[model samples]
Target: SAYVQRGAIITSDGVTLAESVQDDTYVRNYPHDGMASHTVGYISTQYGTAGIESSMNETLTDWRSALYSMAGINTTGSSVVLTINSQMQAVAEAALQGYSGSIVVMDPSTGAVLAKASSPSYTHAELGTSQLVDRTTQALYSPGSSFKTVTLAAGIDTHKTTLDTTYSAPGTMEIGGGTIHNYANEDMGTIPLREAFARSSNTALAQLGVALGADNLVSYARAFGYGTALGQDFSTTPSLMPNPAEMTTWELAWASCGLPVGEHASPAGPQTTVMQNAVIAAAIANGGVVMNPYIVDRVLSPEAVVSTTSPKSLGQAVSADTAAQVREAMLGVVESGTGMGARVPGVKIAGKTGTADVNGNFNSFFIGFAPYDHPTLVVSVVIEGNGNVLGYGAQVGGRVLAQCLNIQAL
Candidate 1:
């Protein structure tokens, strides 16, 4: 009972993604299944529309175009040139297969979203089970130690400490009434601040956070766009960091280590979106400036270029010198640290990994950028409801990044 309709949706390359088919009833068809499902969205007689279908409805089927069609004018719907690189999308999706997670990749300098994928994806037929939503924007996770990158920036930028400043990391440190421990209580003894950062020593970061105090901690967190929405091109949940004014010395220590204390402190609280995490890495890669994230590259037609996106800055999150120091520290992460599993040959991958308990499971996170000397791409991965699988997110991130680099070379 399907009928042919006049409306259509096409990709940047003139490839049809959705089109009408002839039958007794009206029907809208999506050519690609799970691939790009979240972005392309879907249109149907039964379920109206979603995603780009809902957002670009007017442009795709404007009455003007229909009027032109009746007036003997070429009235094909206006097509969108999305920033999404099919190659990167494919690689990212493939890498995250079999995981309950999301991955986002973007250009550091321009904030052009190159790829976004969430695994356990649903097809167009599976519309209302929350599967239809883009988890990359909707779901949140405790960023764990990966957020230490922000703490490190605050320290170096505020001139409270230098990368080479020394700290003593014991198995555990008493904070307020509670104690904070390194991963598995590993004692790093006295080491440079940069080493502690690369090693992701919770004690060192907690100590640094205390030194920054509540006001400084909140200020730096806000500077990095935490506790606020990132204003992404698509739907995005705001990353949160509570006002430290309410935090006790113990609470501040845990918060700095990516595990805030108190009942209100949950993984979903003080949580960050995958997109925000990528921006954090992007900011560091682009010399301490966070750029606004955009997905569509432009709108085009056979006639001429309609419009294009301009790179925009969201403002500085850290000083260039602070960024440089953190950048070096991140490099050290891949060289010999928790993020060592993310290393890729011929690509100086600078990265950090996060693991925290959330939603009755462990949320593992990895955020990184490649070619450390001159970064072009930033990637963030978060897996939710997984066990304490060490380095799982890093492994996924590394594979996808390698795929992207390989595809770009071709």
Candidate 2:
């Protein structure tokens, strides 16, 4: 038996998600089929590997295990233990059952991924041509109004606007020959900054963006982890943002409201992944500090622990005061704004809702954290394809957050 058995892939709660079983030959098996297909990934002899199967292949099929097997010593390869909580993952997947989107849950304080569920999932049996994509990190979508959080942060941090700042926010407005319309053309007339943000008024945010100018907005966005590489544990597509110098006045306004101007397919448009949005929420939740998002918590060998992933700070995204101000506005979103759909009773939740138009189809999003006093979980949800209802994403996020926090009603 020269074949060395691959190590198991287990959850934070010690439930095996994937393992190698030996019969006539060692075969990879997934105990919870299609549960975390994207995150756990699949391994096939003919097609090779993807996801964690590919990322951590070396450790799972350790060279030392082969050496030990060759010497007639009994040993398995090193196992990878993930930060994923299986229950929360199940809840997230269930929430996206009929949708084409992803849900990402994270520990804001430590950057540990608790649940990452991408819809259109696959099973090992359907491996030949299933949805092998991990939307949480691989796929990018417009951030829509959810990105207003960043714009708001930029404004407050630069002193261009404050919670008490006021703007004339009509249902429709013209900026540099481009039209900006609030969702469903809901006009609030003249509103203060906090109310404008809570209601997700595009006109208000666009005006704020123009006031702060492109340079300040772009710098604050970069500080929020846009266009940055995540690391080796997980392969992430860097979120894209338009060049400040290249943006027209209208384009700047659009980008400020988290919409792509000009060509929809252009690389200069604002786009981000579910993972990145989760990091954004985590940054605010952790007092403006962006931690390095990680899934694998540690690696262990049969004999000893190999390595543990320590929590690391990428950098401060904004001043703590700025973060607190944003958090206060986000709370208004859940309490009395568009994010009302994500509200949990007795638990103060801070959230932002986004509805982005992509080629006439809508992509809805919600990024939030719970128990506002001392946050613990950061949840980001995005639903693609005709999710015109802005509250849809918030509802999905609410379900996942409720499950994670053990709240009774969603």
Candidate 3:
């Protein structure tokens, strides 16, 4: 027969994530069931194909190799090796159980996606449902205070504010007919920018946003990959920020605090994907350079290695000094502030916690990196729904990070 067998989709550790098994017909089988389901995707006559199955179809089918089989020569399609680590992916998925959210883990230095898990996932048997969406790359949500890191970086880089710069952070501040308040109306008093960042003060950031102006804030947001399409091997949505010209005084303040305002407010607003947040953390972990996130690591033909992925830089989102300053403040968050739930004994962690209100529902989020001095992993988590306990996202991120590092407290 002229048909060439479809190749496998494997992990970096040599686990076959997806393979075509020859039964009555060549059927696509996912060995891990629902693990990495969205990234590996699925193929069916009714559903066609999605994820890597669709993106790498030409290589997986290998029409050129089929010609060789037709001419009586043995041939098979090329195998794709992804950067995903199955063990870590399992941990990430387990962490998100019983929640509707997404978790993304990556190598900060290389931009290699180690694990991308979206909750409310479906196994192969449950494919009939409409839960096939990959929330990490496809779904958009407000980043909440996680976006404050961007605002801080912009302020520091532009020399508009220093970590020690003091601001009047009251319980509530009114600007342009709208009022912004800190969590629980806790009057933080007049505090340094560093303290404001560590405490995730909405009022402080709102004021900082106004000080930085709309143009500066938007520019820095874009520099950090907002409103930009990322990921080369598959489709990804761009994280959006409103145009400066369209922003009102209060709207800019709200946007600075990671909330949407004006006509761009919730239900239709400044939004980000889990993948984008991961990139933001990765950029800070990697000294401010945003490495282009990648999934596919290599492509191997039956006889030889045909292609491989190299770490590529998207560009510097912030200067090394700016990143360092932000990193210090983030460390304060885990050490003594709101992100204490993410701390691991004997290991340094830097992170930020976010709670966003969208259409009357709250979404909890955490973005962090481990072993602060030399970060190997960057984690981004978002739990979508109401009644989410404060710091729950940080706890989820901590569990994954601790397990990945094999760390335990005595």
Candidate 4:
């Protein structure tokens, strides 16, 4: 029974099948999973296919139907042309290809998700092996300091803290048997909030989140459209936020750091909040817009670019001044901080580096925008695939980020 249950999937640039009888490679710039895995659903034909492949059999059911007949591509159907640059897409692809993490790069002004990357991503081959499908959008992980941007913005909006304000990180803090300290179990001393933010002092941020108290995530979630979907019209999975169900100081502090109750009890993931994390990165990168991301740019039909996606205003995530100020601080993160790995000369790169310790399976993440002062590309990298050591995003971010940005300069 188990042998019969085993099957296959094949989705890449657009070809997923159970079994190929002949040595034929169907060439189409479309994978059955397409852009729907995170947005829409796929249709399944047999016991093997799942996710969008199995869910939406009505539209995507028959491969050999009139749909394939249109493969002449000369005939013409709804052609979707996205703003995704093939090269940039590949850059993102290669950046996280071997890892097991998530990456999101978006336009700050308009909520346009530019490049959404994830390591251990499923094209189709992955679906046939397991039942739980569509892990990228479905999985959640604690984003570490990467989510600090949201806490910062919420603090600003709620009038909880300011650029000149101070949070004493004189040393270690004890709350419920455990101690929270700076990244290195050190003290940041009494410093201005701006400097602390630039330094990404974990102790300072955790304290700030606690001080801001209650509804911080509420304000942030509303601003960034977190609890709600982008209406990308796919699955019903929601990016969760703190609820009344939580009742501990540790819970609150850890939650602020992107860890939630019952998170990563296993070796896999249950990522905290990417939108919340992106809110932080986007706030600094987009001058405070926390721009919502939509994938499909223009559905095409050879004659013209159809269904162009316009940038929509999610909300005022932060002030232009605050955003710019934070952007300045983040630039320091690259110029003189741990993210020094991301220096791309003439590109004006500004970014943040995050390393999450989930037991031993560490994950390194980098959120960046190129031509820094006036970004044209938002880059994110996650590495761990192909037996790579966990936490390679830092190095991969630097290497690929260098090539992507400097290629233009060269």
Candidate 5:
């Protein structure tokens, strides 16, 4: 009857238990602070299912990743090769040891999502029933200025603004009767499209949103696979890519600045947010061609077992030219801008910073890939609470990237 769960945990699937999850001590034991309101999920339980648990069910439950070569069903049907480096994932997680929020790292060339995780997860004890749910992948959050990446893509792809183009960020943008304000209510001086994106200038992005005519943002986001499910059976949300909806221009407008309503507010569009955000990072790393984000590389079977998921391209959402321009702009972000802390000593790291809303708290985030000039790994982290320590992508997620490099340095 005496059990103590150390911390809420996450399973092979991405299920996270709410602070209100039930462990059914009536049936078995639990971890130390099993009730500490940590993460709770269940890949091995009965009742409500969610997160990676539900996303990759077929692979494990139906033995999909474990197909038989004898049947010639292509045991190597798709051995997903996630892009996240285990060492980096460990460093990233360790970096947020005591913090809250999400953390992820992936490979750009492979669409392999290496590590996609979040804190406040759950333990198995609580899996007896359906009580836990992850707020990171499932919960809706305001992505702050991150969506601007996508908006910018829309602007560029749709021929709205050029890289050298300039605009005035007098500090606020007027939209739909509501005034779009810059972060901390600060005004960015006359900045160009490149500078606006690197600086995370809210006014510029907001202006771009309206300038893109709303429909433009929706189209780009749709192309990025927003309002649509993403990931694979190997990644957290296996066999699932939440279908993101094409909300109205207000949706794209607000989404561009993290002010959209309903679906525009969370999980449904976060992956799309990733597409845009990743594009921001990639534009800098890959010189354009915003690649589709993915995790698992290929499923395997040895006895002529599945070799790997034949690398399939999700198609480029941005042009090589447009991507290169954006990439050039993002460079400033790392060298002399917001993501300065994300820079690695010997490796050039290209990335962007974000601070999304978490209820009454802030989710500090970082999205980047390194050897910046010649990208490799892409890491994203959302550190919540942790007082003073909380900040944008640079300090939170960026630091994790730096730490990952440290481990790799070892």
Candidate 6:
């Protein structure tokens, strides 16, 4: 007696992913395993199904699929057309290979995912409950200085501040009770918001956040896709934000800069997913419109069209003018400030960097988009553990972005 065979899966560009082979029973094997397990998902007998396999089980194993196989009409399972570009995916994963973190790259204009890579990950062959986790959209993290972009947005949008608005950026200030200090405790006295921003001045941003007040801060952060999820094609947790109205001056100060405050602290501090960070950059790149993030672009069927996800706007998070103001400031960050490591020669890059404290450990973060005048790609990366290395995270992001642009030229 012969055993039945299941279906195979492949990338949008015709790269084979998974296939079924007959032994005593049918077994699914992933050729390019760990690189994309989170996005493609896995099929298991011990476990049920997961990822795309779990999400589209019916389509993969339905009567029509088997019928077509037997009839030699369409033997393959209905393919899941993802927005991922295989080359970029490989480059992203390879770039993040040594780090235990995640990187998400997307087309800012269309909200199409180009690559989502998570390190310290596992393949289906080495199945475990822990490996099933998808960090790209699931793992929450503290945004650190990368979040000042939100502060800049809120301040500018509320008409209370501008790029030229100057603030006294003392190295340390006491608010509520705890002290707020600039990175390396450096004092940048009486600098404009643009300089404060490019310098990633915690003291300046904290003052700005408190001055802007909590309500506007939280509202603007929410608009940038914090305190909510983008509801992409896969599972994702809404990036967390505390209600500003209830926060103390100290807590609000911390939150204003994307740091943890009050009850929001974790071993990980105020938490957010990498996808959320990516969307934040995408919104800025996309003229303040938060586009819905999706992985599978469409599902194909043998007979008829299945389902297709389209580019959608979550709504305008800020005015084009507001985004424009922030965009130039971000450019300065890479050109001459904290984000210098994120710069690409001959190509303008706008980005922010963060070194966040989680419990006693640290997580490094970088979020940015390329070719400043007309943005094309947005890349977000968080390297967990050993995040104190200066400009390290941005270096990873910059290298990834450069390779992506060099290869794609799109």
Q: What's each prediction's TM-score?
A: 0.88, 0.93, 0.93, 0.73, 0.71, 0.90
Instruction: Give residue 288's lDDT in candidate 5 (0 to 100).
Output: 50
lDDT score for candidate 4 against the true structure: 0.54
lDDT scores for all predictions?
0.77, 0.85, 0.85, 0.54, 0.53, 0.79
lDDT of 1 at 97: 73
Question: 217-258, model 6: which lDDT tens digit per residue?
Answer: 778877877766665666678887676656778888888888
After superposition, candidate 3 runs with Cα above 4 Å error = 23-25, 62-74, 128-130, 264-269, 407-410
Q: Model 3, 389: alpha-carbon shift in Å? A: 2.7
Q: How many residue pairs clash in each candidate?
A: 5, 0, 1, 24, 65, 1
Give the winner by TM-score: 2 or 6. 2
Weakest 10 consecutive residues of candidate 4 by summed lDDT: 1-10
- Expressed as tens digits, the lDDT of each residue in 329-389 for candidate 3 is 8899899889999988888888999988545767889999987898898999998775546
Candidate 2 regions with alpha-carbon error over 4 angstroms: 23-25, 45-48, 62-75, 128-130, 262-266, 407-410
Instruction: Give the TM-score comparing model 1 with the true structure, all chains together.
Output: 0.88
Candidate 4 per-residue C-alpha lDDT over 1-410 given as tens digits, one digit per residue, 9 for 90 to 100? 01111112222232232321112323222244433233323333553443432332221213634454344433323333334333444565666544466555555555455445544545444435522333334555566666666667677766777878887775678744556666656687888877777677777777777776646654664566556554242232456665524435655565555555433232211144443455446656777776556554544343454445676666677777777766766677778766777775555777776666545546566666666777655655544333334335556665665565543354
For each of the candidates, the C-alpha root-mean-square deviation to the true structure, in angstroms, is 3.6, 2.9, 3.0, 7.2, 8.8, 3.6
The 10 consecutive residues of candidate 6 with the worst lDDT sum are: 67-76
Candidates ranked, most accurate by TM-score first: 3, 2, 6, 1, 4, 5
Off by over 4 Å in 1: 1-16, 19-26, 43-50, 62-76, 128-130, 262-269, 301-303, 358-360, 385-387
Kindly list the per-residue Cα lDDT of model 5 for residues 1-410, writing each as its tens digit.
11111122222232322211124311222333332221222335354554322343343224643444333332211212233455555555556556566666656665555555556555555444412534334444455666666677678877878978998876776766666666667788888878778878777787787777645665666565554444444222211112235455444555676554535333333332333344345433555544555444433332233435444454567787776666665667778777777766766766667765443656566677766556666666556554543344566556665665565557
Model 3: ten consecutive residues of lowest lDDT: 65-74
- Select the stronger candidate by TM-score from 1 and 3: 3
Q: Which candidate do you rate higher for TM-score, 2 or 4? A: 2
Candidate 1 vs 2: which has more TM-score: 2
Query: lDDT, candidate 6, residue 216?
Result: 78
